[PDB]
Amino acid sequence: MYRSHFIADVTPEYDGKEVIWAGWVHLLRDLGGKKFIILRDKTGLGQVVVDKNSSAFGISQELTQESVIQVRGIVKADKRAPRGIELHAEEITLLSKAKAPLPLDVSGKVKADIDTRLRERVLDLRRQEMQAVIKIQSLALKAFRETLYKEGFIEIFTPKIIASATEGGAQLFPVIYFGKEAFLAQSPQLYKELMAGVVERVFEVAPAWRAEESDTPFHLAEFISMDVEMAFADYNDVMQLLEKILHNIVKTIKEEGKEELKILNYEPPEVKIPIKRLKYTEAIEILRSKGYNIKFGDDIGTPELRILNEELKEDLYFIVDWPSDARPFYTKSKSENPELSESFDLIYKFLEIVSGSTRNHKREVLEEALKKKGLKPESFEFFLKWFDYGMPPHAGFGMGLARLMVMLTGIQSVKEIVPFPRDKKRLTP
Amino acid sequence: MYRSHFIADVTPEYDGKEVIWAGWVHLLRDLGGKKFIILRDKTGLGQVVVDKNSSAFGISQELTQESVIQVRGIVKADKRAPRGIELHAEEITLLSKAKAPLPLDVSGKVKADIDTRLRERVLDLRRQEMQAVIKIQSLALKAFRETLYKEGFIEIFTPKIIASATEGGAQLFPVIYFGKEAFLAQSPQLYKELMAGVVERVFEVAPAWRAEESDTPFHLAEFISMDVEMAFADYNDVMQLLEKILHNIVKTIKEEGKEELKILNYEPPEVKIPIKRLKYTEAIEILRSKGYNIKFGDDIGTPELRILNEELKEDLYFIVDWPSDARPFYTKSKSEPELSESFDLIYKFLEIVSGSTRNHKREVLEEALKKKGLKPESFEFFLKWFDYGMPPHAGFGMGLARLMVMLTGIQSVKEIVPFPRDKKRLTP
Numbered sequence: 067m068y069r070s071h072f073i074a075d076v077t078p079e080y081d082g083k084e085v086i087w088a089g090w091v092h093l094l095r096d097l098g099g100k101k102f103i104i105l106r107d108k109t110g111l112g113q114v115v116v117d118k119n120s121s122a123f124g125i126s127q128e129l130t131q132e133s134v135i136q137v138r139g140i141v142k143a144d145k146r147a148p149r150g151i152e153l154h155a156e157e158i159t160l161l162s163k164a165k166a167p168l169p170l171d172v173s174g175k176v177k178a179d180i181d182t183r184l185r186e187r188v189l190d191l192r193r194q195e196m197q198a199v200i201k202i203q204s205l206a207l208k209a210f211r212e213t214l215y216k217e218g219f220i221e222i223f224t225p226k227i228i229a230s231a232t233e234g235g236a237q238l239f240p241v242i243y244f245g246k247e248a249f250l251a252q253s254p255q256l257y258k259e260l261m262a263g264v265v266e267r268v269f270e271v272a273p274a275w276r277a278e279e280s281d282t283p284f285h286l287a288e289f290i291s292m293d294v295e296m297a298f299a300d301y302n303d304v305m306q307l308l309e310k311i312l313h314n315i316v317k318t319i320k321e322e323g324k325e326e327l328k329i330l331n332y333e334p335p336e337v338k339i340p341i342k343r344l345k346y347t348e349a350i351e352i353l354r355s356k357g358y359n360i361k362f363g364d365d366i367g368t369p370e371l372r373i374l375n376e377e378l379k380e381d382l383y384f385i386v387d388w389p390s391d392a393r394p395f396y397t398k399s400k401s402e403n404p405e406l407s408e409s410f411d412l413i414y415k416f417l418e419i420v421s422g423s424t425r426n427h428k429r430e431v432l433e434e435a436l437k438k439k440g441l442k443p444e445s446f447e448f449f450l451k452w453f454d455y456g457m458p459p460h461a462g463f464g465m466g467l468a469r470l471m472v473m474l475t476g477i478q479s480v481k482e483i484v485p486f487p488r489d490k491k492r493l494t495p
Numbered sequence: 496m497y498r499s500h501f502i503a504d505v506t507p508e509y510d511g512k513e514v515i516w517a518g519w520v521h522l523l524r525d526l527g528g529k530k531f532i533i534l535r536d537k538t539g540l541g542q543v544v545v546d547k548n549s550s551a552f553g554i555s556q557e558l559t560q561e562s563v564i565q566v567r568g569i570v571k572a573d574k575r576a577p578r579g580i581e582l583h584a585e586e587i588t589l590l591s592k593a594k595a596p597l598p599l600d601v602s603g604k605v606k607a608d609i610d611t612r613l614r615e616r617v618l619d620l621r622r623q624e625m626q627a628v629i630k631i632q633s634l635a636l637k638a639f640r641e642t643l644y645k646e647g648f649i650e651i652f653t654p655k656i657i658a659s660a661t662e663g664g665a666q667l668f669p670v671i672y673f674g675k676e677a678f679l680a681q682s683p684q685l686y687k688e689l690m691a692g693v694v695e696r697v698f699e700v701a702p703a704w705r706a707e708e709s710d711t712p713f714h715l716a717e718f719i720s721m722d723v724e725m726a727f728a729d730y731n732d733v734m735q736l737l738e739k740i741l742h743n744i745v746k747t748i749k750e751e752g753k754e755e756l757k758i759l760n761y762e763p764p765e766v767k768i769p770i771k772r773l774k775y776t777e778a779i780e781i782l783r784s785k786g787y788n789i790k791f792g793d794d795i796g797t798p799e800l801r802i803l804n805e806e807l808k809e810d811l812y813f814i815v816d817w818p819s820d821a822r823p824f825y826t827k828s829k830s831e832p833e834l835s836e837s838f839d840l841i842y843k844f845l846e847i848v849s850g851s852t853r854n855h856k857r858e859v860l861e862e863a864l865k866k867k868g869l870k871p872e873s874f875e876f877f878l879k880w881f882d883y884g885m886p887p888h889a890g891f892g893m894g895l896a897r898l899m900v901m902l903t904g905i906q907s908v909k910e911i912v913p914f915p916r917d918k919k920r921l922t923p
């Protein structure tokens with residue numbers, strides 16, 4: 067196409083050979099009457115030299131950072147040079163010239179806030195660091211599906227535009243839909259249960275949306291959700307599935323993203339099996355005993371997760387068995403105590419990465435649960451009806467991709483992970 | 496847990512052994528004082544028989560179709576039975592009791608109305624033919640990504656809510672987005688072009704939406720769209736890749752989806768490399784060479800395509816070099832310009848994929864927008880990025896559901912998509 071080799075394809079064993087590189091002008095320096103071009107392509111950064119008496123010298127002088135070029139030259143081994151080589155330019159073609167100067171420095175280090183970078187997001191995304199994020203995410207999805215296929219999970223796609231919400235109180239985006247006010251789904255919840263009720267084992271990785279104005283970290287309005295629903299399984303089963311998933315994920319990043327982690331100065335945690343389980347009951351007591359005003363039944367906020375993290379000597383733990391009263395109507399209660407529920411959160415340090423549970427499967431227990439939350443059963447008929455015709459016991463979870471990315475990169479901002487973030491003040495690009 | 500084995504695991508070399516099945520009561524019949532239960536699960540259909548001398552008998556008497564049960568029994572080989580085995584039940588546990596009668600038959604050759612089936616979609620989808628389709632789509636997706644991984648492609652996700660349209664005059668769904676009227680995207684277009692401009696090779700498989708009120712077949716309002724964008728490629732490179740993808744999908748379906756194709760009575764077309772490339776220009780000349788009322792520059796539609804399917808004796812084929820003015824502003828015109836570097840992939844009479852090489856110069860994008868009679872200033876959110884080194888690139892978008900017709904032979908999009916969405920369909 068526009069090249070014979072990617073930069074990284076060339077080894078010292080290429081000395082004296084003619085190669086064609088293509089890519090971006092990363093840097094441009096002049097030393098000793100020689101022009102040095104650091105070129106960038108998807109494999110990384112090479113070094114090209116244009117000496118005075120080359121025919122490429124003339125055009126090399128008009129080149130600017132982020133212009134796209136083709137360069138044909140002869141490989142020279144060196145060892146003082148990147149990966150032990152450099153390209154001695156003979157011919158350079160200008161494919162696409164960039165305006166100068168740049169509004170954002172692709173090699174300058176992070177200057178300006180998030181919002182200034184989002185005006186020049188492409189230039190920002192081109193930075194080694196962001197490139198590494200984009201790469202790791204892709205590997206993370208591959209490893210996610212791989213584990214699932216091994217367990218015979220079937221990949222699915224459920225409706226994103228829905229008539230009414232599954233959990234009232236959740237704020238959904240209005241969609242004007244052929245004359246009706248419909249909404250954007252917040253999760254595939256009902257549909258994946260349904261599809262579990264037909265082919266048993268299903269996942270979906272896909273967009274979801276939430277309309278709140280919460281300004282805390284990690285609360286984009288649009289977000290990718292990684293969902294799994296498993297028939298003839300309860301919450302302990304799926305927790306063990308996820309363990310294996312997460313393990314294959316970090317293992318893939320560690321082997322296939324060695325270089326990316328290097329650019330990131332980051333080492334994802336070990337996934338020890340089993341992951342520490344801590345009952346919610348016990349979490350409440352650790353908190354109380356350190357002096358926080360927290361009663362059984364209360365939520366466990368970020369501030370609490372910090373102390374929980376600071377106390378467990380574990381970065382990666384499940385919080386299992388929450389109060390039934392704080393979990394959806396579709397979540398199975400504990401048999402030995404109705405006040406508790408067969409649910410879990412997976413926390414990484416102080417961030418929630420996954421939530422799941424064992425679900426209900428009888429219409430009557432579902433209908434009771436709805437009453438126990440003061441909802442009108444007749445208004446969830448769209449959910450209840452399917453359970454008249456043999457819904458099996460099932461269990462599932464949802465993990466947030468970009469939250470999982472924090473565990474895989476070290477980046478502490480979701481707007482730094484998602485290449486085109488959406489929230490209350492952010493719609494473009 | 497609930498089972499010890501799936502129905503398809505158990506073979507004759509299991510004789511005398513105890514086995515736990517979990518599944519759905521597909522069929523009940525009584526014969527010779529003996530109860531017959533056709534059990535179903537994700538692997539398929541199995542035969543359980545309950546003797547009158549069994550303790551499982553009494554609960555066996557109250558089972559209804561589609562109930563979820565657990566049957567502990569012993570395997571006996573028979574070779575008159577499915578997979579040469581059946582299960583003589585010792586205990587039966589009732590997990591989920593289903594109401595009687597069923598409003599839709601799972602065991603039946605169910606000739607019912609579409610909206611009637613939508614009303615009871617879970618039962619509908621449990622038919623072997625539907626499970627087939629579901630399973631094949633999964634296999635298709637895996638194969639698709641597998642090919643793209645081999646070539647270095649990176650999986651992206653692009654924004655679904657957007658400020659404004661890319662194709663003007665295209666109808667998008669309004670979203671009320673923090674006080675503003677935003678829209679659902681109809682494709683990742685701009686965004687996958689921008690991602691290719693950072694890491695060269697990308698793909699995305701994700702929902703898109705159009706809001707037109709069509710009444711023609713294969714025009715769901717929400718659809719899963721498989722996109723690929725590739726820097727330093729032109730359309731011919733991306734068509735080659737497309738072929739390589741479709742080849743692998745067909746192979747994977749034929750090898751891994753054997754029983755599914757069996758249930759469906761269907762054989763996928765052969766992806767013959769290279770797939771026929773029919774120049775638009777020649778497509779018009781053929782349509783004229785038989786008796787038709789078409790001129791160069793006119794659109795080729797479904798009538799015209801049924802006709803092309805015949806004339807070409809090829810079921811899979813590209814129509815290429817469409818008139819530049821029938822094509823988006825971001826599609827690059829041919830070097831030698833009334834024509835553009837564009838293609839559509841066709842299966843018989845149905846458009847499956849479209850793509851092209853893209854423009855990458857601000858100037859030519861602006862011009863293209865003037866010559867279509869649009870005002871560049873309104874498209875500034877597209878143009879701006881091309882100021883800072885967008886490389887040559889190209890790409891395509893393939894409808895998952897339309898692909899699916901090629902893989903299954905099913906002629907209705909609402910028989911492929913589990914929970915379809917259109918002007919008169921929102922629930923389920």
Ligand SMILES: [Cl-]
Pocket residue numbers: 231232233234236252
């Ligand atoms: Cl909801």
Ligand SMILES: [Cl-]
Pocket residue numbers: 659660661662663665681
């Ligand atoms: Cl658009």
